[PDB]
Amino acid sequence: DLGTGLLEALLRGDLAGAEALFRRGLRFWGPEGVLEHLLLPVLREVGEAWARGEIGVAEEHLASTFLRARLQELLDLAGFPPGPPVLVTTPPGERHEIGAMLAAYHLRRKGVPALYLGPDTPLPDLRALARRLGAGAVVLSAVLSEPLRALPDGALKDLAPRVFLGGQGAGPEEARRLGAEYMEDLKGLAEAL
Amino acid sequence: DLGTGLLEALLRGDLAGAEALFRRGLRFWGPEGVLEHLLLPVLREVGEAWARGEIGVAEEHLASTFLRARLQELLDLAGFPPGPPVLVTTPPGERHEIGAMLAAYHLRRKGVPALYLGPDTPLPDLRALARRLGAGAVVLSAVLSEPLRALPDGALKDLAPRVFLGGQGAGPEEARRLGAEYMEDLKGLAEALWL
Amino acid sequence: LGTGLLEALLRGDLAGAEALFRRGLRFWGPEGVLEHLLLPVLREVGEAWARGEIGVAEEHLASTFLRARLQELLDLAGFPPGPPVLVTTPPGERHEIGAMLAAYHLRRKGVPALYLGPDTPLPDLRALARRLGAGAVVLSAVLSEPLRALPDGALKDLAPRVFLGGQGAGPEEARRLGAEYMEDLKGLAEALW
Amino acid sequence: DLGTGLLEALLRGDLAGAEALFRRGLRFWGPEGVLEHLLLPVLREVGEAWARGEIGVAEEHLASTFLRARLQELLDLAGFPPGPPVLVTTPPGERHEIGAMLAAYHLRRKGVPALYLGPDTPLPDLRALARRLGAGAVVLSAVLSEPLRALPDGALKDLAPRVFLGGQGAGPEEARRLGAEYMEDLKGLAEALW
Numbered sequence: 001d002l003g004t005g006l007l008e009a010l011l012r013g014d015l016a017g018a019e020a021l022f023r024r025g026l027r028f029w030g031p032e033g034v035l036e037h038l039l040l041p042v043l044r045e046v047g048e049a050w051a052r053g054e055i056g057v058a059e060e061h062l063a064s065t066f067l068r069a070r071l072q073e074l075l076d077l078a079g080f081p082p083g084p085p086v087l088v089t090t091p092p093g094e095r096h097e098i099g100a101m102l103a104a105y106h107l108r109r110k111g112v113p114a115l116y117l118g119p120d121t122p123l124p125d126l127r128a129l130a131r132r133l134g135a136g137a138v139v140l141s142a143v144l145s146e147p148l149r150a151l152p153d154g155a156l157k158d159l160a161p162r163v164f165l166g167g168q169g170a171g172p173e174e175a176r177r178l179g180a181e182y183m184e185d186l187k188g189l190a191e192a193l
Numbered sequence: 194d195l196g197t198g199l200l201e202a203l204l205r206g207d208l209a210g211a212e213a214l215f216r217r218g219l220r221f222w223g224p225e226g227v228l229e230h231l232l233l234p235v236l237r238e239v240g241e242a243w244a245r246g247e248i249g250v251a252e253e254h255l256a257s258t259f260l261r262a263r264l265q266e267l268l269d270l271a272g273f274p275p276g277p278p279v280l281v282t283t284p285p286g287e288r289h290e291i292g293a294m295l296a297a298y299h300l301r302r303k304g305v306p307a308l309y310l311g312p313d314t315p316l317p318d319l320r321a322l323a324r325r326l327g328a329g330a331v332v333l334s335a336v337l338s339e340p341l342r343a344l345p346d347g348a349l350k351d352l353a354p355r356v357f358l359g360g361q362g363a364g365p366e367e368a369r370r371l372g373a374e375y376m377e378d379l380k381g382l383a384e385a386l387w388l
Numbered sequence: 389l390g391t392g393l394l395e396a397l398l399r400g401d402l403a404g405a406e407a408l409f410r411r412g413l414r415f416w417g418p419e420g421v422l423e424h425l426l427l428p429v430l431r432e433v434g435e436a437w438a439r440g441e442i443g444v445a446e447e448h449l450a451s452t453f454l455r456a457r458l459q460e461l462l463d464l465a466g467f468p469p470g471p472p473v474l475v476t477t478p479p480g481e482r483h484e485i486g487a488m489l490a491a492y493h494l495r496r497k498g499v500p501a502l503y504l505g506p507d508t509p510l511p512d513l514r515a516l517a518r519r520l521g522a523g524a525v526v527l528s529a530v531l532s533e534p535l536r537a538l539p540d541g542a543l544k545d546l547a548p549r550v551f552l553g554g555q556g557a558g559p560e561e562a563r564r565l566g567a568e569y570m571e572d573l574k575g576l577a578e579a580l581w
Numbered sequence: 582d583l584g585t586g587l588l589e590a591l592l593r594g595d596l597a598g599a600e601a602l603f604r605r606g607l608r609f610w611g612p613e614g615v616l617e618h619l620l621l622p623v624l625r626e627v628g629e630a631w632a633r634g635e636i637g638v639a640e641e642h643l644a645s646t647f648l649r650a651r652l653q654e655l656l657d658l659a660g661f662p663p664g665p666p667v668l669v670t671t672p673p674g675e676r677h678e679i680g681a682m683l684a685a686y687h688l689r690r691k692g693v694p695a696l697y698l699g700p701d702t703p704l705p706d707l708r709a710l711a712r713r714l715g716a717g718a719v720v721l722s723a724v725l726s727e728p729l730r731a732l733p734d735g736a737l738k739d740l741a742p743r744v745f746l747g748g749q750g751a752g753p754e755e756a757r758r759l760g761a762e763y764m765e766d767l768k769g770l771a772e773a774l775w
């Protein structure tokens with residue numbers, strides 16, 4: 001019920017209602033749970049409604065901007081330990097950022113200093129920041145497959161000592177082609193580190 | 194002065210330090226003060242450092258993502274009062290969003306329910322949402338001039354009962370060509386709407 | 389917010405109190421709301437009690453409310469793997485918010501602080517530390533009397549590191565009891581790292 | 582069995598695992614059900630393990646602090662309706678608080694503004710807060726019998742127009758002596774108020 005209620009509140013511009021329903025989900029499912037059982041299903045349904053032609057981009061934007069804000073709050077409430085950061089972003093041309101934010105969140109919740117950069121970072125710039133910050137790892141979220149298919153073989157090799165790639169747009173073959181370690185589960189990311 | 198310290202902390206990935214310095218600014222200068230004297234100058238300097246080749250886009254992204262989060266907090270503090278919403282966004286092709294967020298903040302501070310959509314909204318979709326929600330106005334932030342130049346004469350005219358345009362990419366002539374009311378100053382935005 | 393929050397609590401307006409606390413959180417940040425809102429309100433409640441302006445029930449109400457808010461923040465910090473740091477108060481010490489604050493500051497810096505609750509008998513504390521391979525024990529003393537009740541060296545070897553702080557603690561008493569004295573919550577994470 | 586798994590996770594200081602298992606119980610049984618099928622059995626078992634010398638007080642504390650946090654989430658989810666509050670606490674000397682929290686939860690679920698004070702409230706102070714808030718009722722949870730035995734005849738009378746007493750430490754005779762209405766069932770609490 002909270003998912004439908006939340007989507008409906010957003011689609012009618014009822015931010016207060018949407019906030020109350022999100023907080024309810026947080027209290028019931030917990031931090032990781034609200035993301036899996038509320039934030040993610042609502043975003044999926046928004047995307048499907050858009051793809052079906054039922055809503056425009058403005059409705060989609062409204063819901064995503066709201067949910068991004070909520071996730072950013074949770075991100076900031078997680079610990080940020082000292083020590084070599086893990087840089088988190090998306091490939092050049094990838095502007096879906098919530099998957100990356102989720103990765104940063106799960107890492108921080110497990111005591112890893114994940115620096116979320118925002119999406120869509122050119123690889124030379126990403127490499128330079130990693131080298132300058134002594135980053136132990138880089139993590140990339142790919143929602144679309146096209147930004148990965150545009151990259152040359154081995155492009156993600158050595159962005160940092162460890163490079164992880166995951167998301168709906170990514171598969172093990174593409175990761176291998178690009179020279180990244182493929183990760184299927186957000187919970188396996190912390191383990192790998 | 195906090196600006197230098199804040200930028201330095203960000204560029205070395207010291208989020209906690211950056212947050213402490215921003216909070217210090219908030220406690221000393223207040224919300225409006227910290228926006229004018231800390232958030233805006235740091236963003237301008239990051240842009241200039243990028244343009245001069247001193248930092249890459251990753252550093253720029255980091256600072257902007259951090260400052261967006263801080264402004265989002267302020268936006269939520271300003272509240273979302275009842276009444277017909279004002280939709281706030283940027284023109285198609287404009288992905289700089291902090292100006293729009295600032296406009297939403299200033300409106301909310303004056304009791305106007307500014308719904309920030311995110312950036313880069315197609316005009317017919319924006320118009321449809323305004324109609325469906327009974328929005329009293331639309332506000333657009335233009336940082337680049339090119340997204341405005343791409344638009345046909347009068348394109349902004351009827352997005353909602355009132356349409357406001359401002360930002361670095363906007364000027365009075367272009368606003369007039371596009372049929373929007375041109376606004377220089379964020380704080381007079383709520384006044385313009387009331388009047 | 390401090391006055392508004394105390395006034396809301398004293399009228400039994402929990403919803404209003406929650407709204408005002410959330411405002412403080414958004415403005416000051418997590419550590420800031422503790423320093424600028426939670427701590428001043430608790431000190432003022434204590435002073436009002438001591439002056440006979442309110443009774444213990446009003447004090448209970450405010451502390452139970454603020455404990456719940458701190459517990460939320462604690463749960464949102466996330467819990468990293470690795471040897472825990474056990475956090476509690478000395479036997480006879482029932483003021484627990486100082487201990488919760490210590491656990492919070494540790495978790496915010498990526499230290500797995502296990503908050504046990506207050507008032508833990510020392511043999512039981514030592515046994516759990518041993519059994520979990522805890523790297524440290526942290527004690528918050530608000531009153532001085534629970535420390536005075538302990539024999540010389542009583543806190544020695546609870547764990548490889550034992551830290552004592554709070555209003556009821558001073559360096560001489562820490563030395564008598566065989567604990568390391570800590571003045572600042574911010575120095576605690578440093579000492580461990 | 583989620584109960585065994587949850588207790589084991591707690592006893593080894595695996596908070597993340599404990600939280601996951603509790604959330605699983607919540608998703609499966611729902612709020613009332615997780616209390617009956619998971620929270621309460623685990624607390625009872627912790628007490629028995631302590632009494633048998635298998636665990637110390639630190640393990641017991643850890644489990645109850647965790648489960649108190651979960652119940653606090655449920656209390657806040659139940660919401661806090663407007664109107665004259667019902668104050669909920671425990672007798673002076675009674676430091677077991679989860680029974681009181683449960684009473685507050687069941688009341689809130691039925692639309693009663695149950696204000697949970699925390700445990701162990703001196704009676705003059707409790708009376709004064711009831712007076713100051715215009716409370717319609719006071720509810721006390723007694724786990725131990727000794728805190729009640731220590732109280733004078735009629736000590737609970739007129740804390741508010743309705744005063745309820747229940748829990749393992751309470752019986753109808755002691756309630757009568759103290760001037761409280763005795764309640765056996767948490768679900769009967771809201772009924773009794775009407």
Ligand code: B12
Nearest residue numbers: 044047051064095096097098099141166167168183185186
């Ligand atoms: C919101 C949204 C947008 C927003 C994003 C705003 C923002 N700042 O993030 C905007 C407006 C920018 C947008 C634009 C477009 N997008 Co879009 N949109 C979405 C939507 C509705 C939600 C996105 C989201 O946050 N979802 C949550 C995602 C990230 O979760 P998830 O992928 O299920 O993630 C899980 C796993 O992948 C894993 N994971 C993710 N990252 C990582 C990383 C690691 C290391 C690991 C281990 C795991 C992991 O974590 C999650 C597990 O719970 C989706 C719908 C959907 N996703 O089903 C589309 C969707 C992805 N978008 C789509 C499209 C087509 C577009 C556009 C092409 C449309 C257009 N031409 O304008 C553009 C492309 C822009 C670009 N260059 O990227 C399509 C893509 C379909 C396809 N055929 O591939 C989708 C699926 C919608 C649809 N049903 O068609 N979009």
Ligand code: B12
Nearest residue numbers: 237240244257287288289290291292334359360361376378
């Ligand atoms: C962060 C940033 C980005 C981020 C944006 C991230 C996000 N927002 O989500 C990213 C990396 C995506 C980015 C990309 C690019 N950007 Co950029 N970057 C910036 C930077 C540093 C941000 C500034 C900011 O957010 N400030 C807040 C804005 C609004 O500041 P402001 O315009 O001074 O705002 C004042 C007024 O305009 C007014 N205002 C603003 N909006 C409104 C609305 C109303 C109604 C009113 C009354 C007032 C008002 O209020 C403010 C205070 O007085 C700026 C530097 C700068 N000086 O702005 C550039 C800058 C704007 N970017 C620039 C460029 C060139 C680009 C790119 C083309 C770079 C590239 N080759 O990829 C792309 C284009 C993306 C697009 N739009 O299509 C240039 C533009 C220069 C120009 N050509 O005019 C700048 C100025 C950097 C520079 N000095 O060279 N950018």
Ligand code: B12
Nearest residue numbers: 434438451481482483484485486528553554555570572573
């Ligand atoms: C709430 C409260 C209670 C509640 C606590 C409920 C709970 N926590 O579960 C209850 C009702 C139980 C209570 C009871 C009593 N308390 Co009382 N009460 C308080 C009150 C109002 C707030 C306590 C609190 O959370 N403070 C927040 C604390 C932690 O803040 P702080 O001490 O300034 O802590 C800072 C530093 O110490 C540091 N820190 C803390 N711990 C640690 C640990 C480390 C390692 C480090 C580095 C730093 C650190 O962090 C904080 C911020 O910097 C205070 C008022 C006050 N001034 O504190 C009294 C107060 C502590 N109580 C007091 C008294 C006298 C009592 C009782 C004896 C009275 C009574 N009989 O009712 C009992 C004793 C119970 C017992 N312990 O055995 C007095 C103590 C005065 C004295 N002589 O020392 C106080 C000061 C009130 C007063 N003005 O008289 N109390």
Ligand code: B12
Nearest residue numbers: 628632645675676677678679680722747748749764766767
């Ligand atoms: C956690 C706990 C503690 C914690 C409590 C922390 C806290 N903040 O709550 C701590 C460590 C502080 C503690 C201390 C002690 N406790 Co203890 N501990 C427990 C334990 C394991 C769980 C308590 C709990 O939350 N129970 C959940 C409750 C609510 O379940 P329940 O009581 O069956 O309640 C049901 C009904 O009574 C009803 N109900 C409850 N309240 C109300 C009110 C109304 C109006 C209604 C209608 C119904 C109702 O609803 C509940 C669900 O059906 C129990 C084990 C147990 N079986 O209860 C003991 C237990 C209660 N403790 C016990 C003892 C002995 C102690 C100590 C004396 C030990 C000591 N030597 O120091 C002290 C006394 C402290 C004090 N002065 O109050 C004994 C009491 C035995 C007895 N009476 O003879 C128990 C039974 C353990 C055992 N021996 O097996 N304890």
